[PDB]
Write a protein that binds this ligand. Structure first.
Ligand SMILES: O=C(O)CNC(=O)C(=O)O
Ligand code: NI
Ligand SMILES: [Zn+2]
Length: 331
């Protein structure tokens, strides 16, 4: 078996290899990449997402989110407080202000130490889940707005025709902005391109060990666990690498820099944080190997994990026994 220790693999496709997206995902998996839950893909030197980012300040962040933490430094939840709308230009200025800017630091490791020591004492503001794309329409390779759709994948694999669309989302981050431990909706893949700015550090649990993380989460957030059997779908819980190590949870970490793609694989739990002002684009996607994961994905029915209407068809077709209960949670 390839990659038995479930290490995060890094790929350097040639421009020829970068033509066929599906084929390269399958190639990465043939090398065991999926066992980590996360892979990095560095595009060939000839590739670019767009000409410049010189004209993006007028994008609107309609609902910036202030991420307010509760708990202890290594075990906390965060809730999102809605703030007034601001442009990306205004957001960038805010990110770079004395209140929110990245502190002096020696290297990525020093900054990581500072993040886990001090995150809970600040409330950074995130621009998340903004529908849109920053890929040039003429970018033909790994353009996250031009991928084959999950609906078409399901149709190709299972013969079912369903409603729904899936399009990319933009994320504007600043120092300490945080993404909580989660897998994707329906345990889909995700792909994330860091367009511009400071890095993003990722933590990931191998899919074959995801239930170990779930069991620890239930112990660490006991009230949340009683409220919902799948409460990590609420995307509010953080657990530090120190606490993961203390509890023997297998995981890996890696830092993504501007110009790099990350792919998360079905049922690969991940979390992380931004180093400073940046902009990422991400979208969910599927492959034939995903279908089994979609069938088995655990659902939140408590009402906290409201999702896109695109997910209705996924649950309806792949999980008909769970559909009624889940739909009650969505309404
Ligand atoms: O970048 C972020 O804030 C969160 N991204 C993801 O969880 C992802 O790409 O799957
Ligand atoms: Ni994700
Ligand atoms: Zn729930």
């Amino acid at each position: 078996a390839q990659n038995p220790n479930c290490n995060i693999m890094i790929f350097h496709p040639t421009k020829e290899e970068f033509n066929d997206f599906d084929k390269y995902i399958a190639y990465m998996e043939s090398q065991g990449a999926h066992r980590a839950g996360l892979a990095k893909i560095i595009p060939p030197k000839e590739w670019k997402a767009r000409e410049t980012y010189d004209n993006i300040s007028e994008i609107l962040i309609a609902t910036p989110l202030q991420q307010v933490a509760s708990g202890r430094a290594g075990v906390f939840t965060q809730y999102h407080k809605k703030k007034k709308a601001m442009t990306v230009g205004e957001y960038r200025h805010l990110a770079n202000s004395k209140k929110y800017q990245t502190p002096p630091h020696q290297n990525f490791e020093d900054l990581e130490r500072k993040y886990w020591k001090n995150r809970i004492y600040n409330s950074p503001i995130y621009g998340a889940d903004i529908s849109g794309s920053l890929f040039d329409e003429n970018t033909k390779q790994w353009n996250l707005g031009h991928l084959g759709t999950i609906q078409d994948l399901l149709e190709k694999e299972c013969g079912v025709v369903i409603e729904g669309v899936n399009t990319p989302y933009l994320y504007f981050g600043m120092w300490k902005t945080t993404f909580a431990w989660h897998t994707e909706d329906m345990d889909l893949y995700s792909i994330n391109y860091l367009h511009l700015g400071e890095p993003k550090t990722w933590y990931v649990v191998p899919p074959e060990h995801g239930q170990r993380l779930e069991r620890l989460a239930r112990e660490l957030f006991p009230g949340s666990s009683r409220g919902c059997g799948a409460f990590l779908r609420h995307k509010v819980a953080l657990i530090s690498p120190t606490v993961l190590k203390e509890n023997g949870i297998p995981f890996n970490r890696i830092t993504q820099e501007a110009g790099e793609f990350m792919v998360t694989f079905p049922y690969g739990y991940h979390a992380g944080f931004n180093h400073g002002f940046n902009c990422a684009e991400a979208i969910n996607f599927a492959t034939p190997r995903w279908i089994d994961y979609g069938k088995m994905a655990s659902q939140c029915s408590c009402g906290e994990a409201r999702v896109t209407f695109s997910m209705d068809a996924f649950v309806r077709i792949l999980q008909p026994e769970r559909y009624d209960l889940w739909k009650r949670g969505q309404d």
